[PDB]
Amino acid sequence: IVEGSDAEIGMSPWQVMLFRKSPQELLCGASLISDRWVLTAAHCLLYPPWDKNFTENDLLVRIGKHSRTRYERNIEKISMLEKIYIHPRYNWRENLDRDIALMKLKKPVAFSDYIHPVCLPDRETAASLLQAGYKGRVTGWGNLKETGQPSVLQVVNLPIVERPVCKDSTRIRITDNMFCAGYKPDEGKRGDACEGDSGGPFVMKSPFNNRWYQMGIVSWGEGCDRDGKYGFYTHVFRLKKWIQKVIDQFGE
């Protein structure tokens, strides 16, 4: 996160650290959607151009954290991955469309004050909130600057920008499964997600039932916080039915 603040303890209880076994390293952010399921970005597991292709056995999921590096002794819970599922139409070859992956845990995690699942949006929630100028919130242990590392979890509140705008900001082809967010150079407020933040949650709070909803997944952007550029997220409501298929086809 660039230009954010440290997270309050217990503020984003669905945040998950995607952690690799060796070198012991932070690989990405993520979110807990139930007690056996985590959602992240498929770029986190598979990215051939970069020679990236991680298996269940290459990683751990760390849930309950605030500190980035320390091991949070009676606070964080560590899980082993049972199976990984990437969207069959993840397009890593051109614009990363359908960047989403499900991970199913070897055993369900117990909730606590620091471990709690985010809600998945329904059609009406997606419908009222996902509007240009509404602010959502991104979190991660990621870079503080494009080109260092926080000690604890960062948070930033960013506005959903109008499509055209998103569209005229890059040479990359944008698809209906994407959304961009960030301030405009004129707004005189800034912040973005950055490297290390991928797979984290872009969540919103419902005014109607006052529940938090995961609306997007951290995906791509050019640089971190550049004036006239926006961060792109996977539109979670649009990939919603693939989500229910796998969980039904395979879990819970």
């Binding site: 012991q24 390293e25 932070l26 751990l60 320390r70 091991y71």
Partner: peptide, 8 residues
């Protein structure tokens, strides 16, 4: 990165 328990 602090050390994680090998049980894991």
């Amino acid at each position: 990165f602090e050390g994680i328990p090998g049980e894991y």
